[PDB]
Design a protein around this nucleic acid. Structure first.
Ligand SMILES: Nc1nc2c(ncn2[C@H]2C[C@H](O)[C@@H](COP(=O)(O)OP(=O)(O)OP(=O)(O)O)O2)c(=O)[nH]1
Ligand SMILES: [Ca+2]
Length: 621
DNA sequence: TCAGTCAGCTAGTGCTGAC
DNA sequence: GCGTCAGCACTAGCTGACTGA
């Protein structure tokens, strides 16, 4: 059929006879001298539909003038699949205001003159890029030898302006329906992208989704201004890239130690399960069942010193019912089983072939409070213990520099509440976490070890964020045999909140007024459906900690290009960088300066510090 | 063949890991 | 009522298919 073969030469299949094929354009010449396919069926929307196609034999040099002397532009990238490591970019879209969208067919392109102009347009810092869900596209671009410096992703602006009311969607169609008075009609049910040949309607949608971003940017730049939400948007937009680089690299694991520890812990687990079942009075029990094990404990007459019966096996509550043989074995088995199933029996299933490294997937804003989250193998969940963390190593002749913010929260709260005592203490360079570990224990500061500091962390942050005295005493008597009276905990809670008056003022003033709008130091807003004192207290401080970490990522990413270094992980408040063995001192100094000058921006009165340790293995702090 | 007696999904829980 | 999130494993219940009626 000649009808379906209308526009084959441009690598287009005329599936639908709903198209038509050149017009004079008054472009600007390099000396500042003045010098597209369409669909037959029009759309009621005012969004752009026209577009060009740039092919190997369908290139003209003067196309580059369209991007020349520009300010903002839309960009979208459609890919064959979702695995960046084993997928190739299919299409690039560029949408200039009052211009048709421009398409580079990457499969149907073999020369490099076509691409250099787009390269230069991406490079320039002064050109702001509009990309929906920028993380995906930036991942692909950095993988395929592209370098971006500026982004303005409309998902970020939408979610920040949405004030975290509904957690779902925020796709292009939902946002376009919400803010703009347009309906994109995303009826494309993921058509065949692997095939090089593409139908016309699919490309019309591909150009439409890119073109709709420009009006969205125009309107959101006004909407963000009246809300005073520009700072957080800028920080997030500039921090999109370092997440992508960190996820592109990943962290290496030595398979020999992984397999050795797997076999050893498997043998330990089997002997432990044997001992556990033998200690229990029935052999058919499936141990992992919380309800079956609850019934088993009940029929074994396991009881507390008090008149209570086993209602749950939660570790926090389980730690009280000790001094029975079976429960020590139960807890040891639970620990080993968690370590095995969560990590060791699943980590080998995640080590990518031909790379021998793990790769994760960071969630930019899925968290309520703005922290990162990992949906793929969670590198934020790998255990603390050294013997399990050593398996992570740098590449050959490389060494890690591990920097962690020293007491990042309780520095945020100090500014947000502008308390004098906390800020003076942190000028004096004293450790609040160590002091917490010492006051509720022996008074010897030098005797406080890592575990005691770790327990101090939870109690201190909880009492800052609204924990009442009954639950605090439950926690304290659980994790350390204090056996403290209720009056002792009441006195401690009051002493803390009075010796730091600003925090008590903050609690009183946020409780007295049932405000439903809360802001972070980056003006990141939220609206709660119903008041909850704990979340209300939490959100500003944690949001500011997230903002400080994101700005630190931005500054460190900018500064690290000198030494060819690369970032591999960020978890929640620390950064790991792999740098060559010759530039260790430069890497350490750069990392400390970057973290310092990121923290000193939002916090203008407390001097943040960092614990930096040059490590051969990520486990070996 | 309808009516009464049976495997797969499927959201709900409990638990633990990090910060 | 201290917060954010992700992961592993059960097991009621709904819905669906087989043995009489
Ligand atoms: N509400 C609550 N927030 C926590 C808890 N643990 C950590 N956070 C937050 C606050 C921490 O400052 C932040 C970083 O965790 P870290 O383990 O690094 O604590 P920190 O940096 O203060 O100790 P460090 O100086 O690095 O040894 O995560 C917790 O148990 N409860
Ligand atoms: Ca830290």
């Amino acid at each position: 059929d000649e009808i379906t073969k209308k526009y084959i030469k441009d690598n287009i299949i005329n599936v639908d006879d709903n198209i038509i094929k050149k017009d004079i354009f008054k472009l600007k010449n390099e000396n500042n001298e003045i010098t597209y396919f369409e669909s037959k069926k029009k759309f009621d929307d005012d969004i752009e539909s026209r577009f060009f196609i740039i092919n190997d034999n369908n290139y003209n040099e003067n196309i580059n003038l369209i991007y020349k002397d520009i300010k903002y532009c839309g960009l979208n990238i459609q890919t064959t699949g979702l695995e960046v490591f084993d997928e190739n970019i299919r299409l690039i879209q560029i949408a200039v205001e009052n211009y048709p969208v421009i398409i580079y067919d990457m499969f149907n392109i073999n020369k490099k003159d076509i691409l250099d102009g787009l390269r230069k347009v991406l490079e320039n810092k002064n050109i702001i890029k509009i990309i929906q869900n920028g993380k995906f596209d930036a991942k692909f671009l950095l993988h395929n030898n592209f370098k971006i410096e500026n982004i303005f992703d409309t998902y970020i602006a939408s979610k920040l302006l949405d004030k975290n009311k509904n957690m779902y969607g925020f796709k292009l169609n939902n946002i376009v329906e919400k803010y703009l008075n347009v309906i994109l009609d995303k009826q494309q049910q993921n058509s065949v992208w692997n095939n090089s040949l593409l139908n016309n309607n699919q490309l019309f949608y591909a150009a439409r989704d890119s073109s709709c971003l420009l009006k969205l940017y125009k309107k959101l730049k006004e909407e963000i201004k009246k809300e005073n939400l520009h700072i957080v948007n800028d920080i997030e937009n500039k921090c999109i890239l370092p997440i992508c680089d960190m996820e592109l690299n990943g962290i290496k694991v030595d398979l020999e130690n992984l397999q050795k520890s797997t076999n050893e812990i498997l043998n330990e687990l089997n002997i432990e399960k044997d001992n556990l079942k033998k200690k229990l009075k029935d052999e058919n029990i499936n141990v992992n069942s919380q309800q079956q094990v609850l019934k088993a404990l009940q029929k074994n007459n396991v009881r507390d010193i008090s008149n209570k019966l086993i209602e749950n096996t939660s570790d926090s509550n389980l730690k009280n019912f000790l001094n029975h043989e079976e429960i020590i074995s139960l807890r040891n088995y639970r620990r080993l089983y968690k370590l095995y199933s969560a990590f060791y029996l699943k980590l080998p299933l995640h080590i990518n072939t031909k790379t021998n490294k793990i790769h994760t997937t960071f969630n930019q804003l899925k968290t309520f409070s703005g922290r990162f989250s990992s949906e793929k193998p969670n590198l934020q969940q790998i255990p603390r213990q050294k013997n399990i963390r050593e398996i992570f190593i740098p590449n050959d002749n490389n060494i890690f520099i591990i920097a962690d913010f020293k007491q990042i929260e309780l520095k945020i709260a100090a500014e947000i509440t502008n308390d004098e005592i906390m800020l003076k203490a942190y000028n004096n360079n004293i450790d609040l976490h160590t002091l917490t570990a010492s006051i509720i224990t022996k008074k010897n500061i030098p005797d406080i070890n890592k575990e005691d500091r770790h327990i101090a962390k939870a109690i201190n942050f909880g009492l800052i964020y609204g924990m009442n005295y009954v639950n605090l005493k439950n926690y304290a008597n659980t994790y350390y045999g204090l056996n403290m009276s209720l009056d002792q905990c009441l006195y401690f809670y009051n002493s803390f909140f009075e010796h730091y008056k600003g925090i008590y003022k903050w609690h009183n003033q946020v409780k007295q007024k049932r405000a439903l709008q809360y802001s972070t130091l980056s003006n990141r807003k939220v609206i709660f459906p119903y008041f909850s004192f704990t979340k209300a207290l939490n959100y500003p401080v944690q949001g500011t900690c997230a903002d400080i970490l994101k700005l630190a990522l931005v500054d460190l990413y900018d500064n690290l290009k000198d030494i060819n270094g690369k970032i591999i992980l960020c978890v929640h408040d620390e950064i790991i960088i792999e740098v060559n063995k010759k530039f260790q001192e430069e890497a350490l100094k750069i990392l400390v300066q970057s973290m310092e000058n990121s923290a000193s921006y939002f916090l203008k009165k407390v001097k943040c510090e960092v614990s930096v340790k040059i490590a051969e293995n990520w486990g070996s702090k």
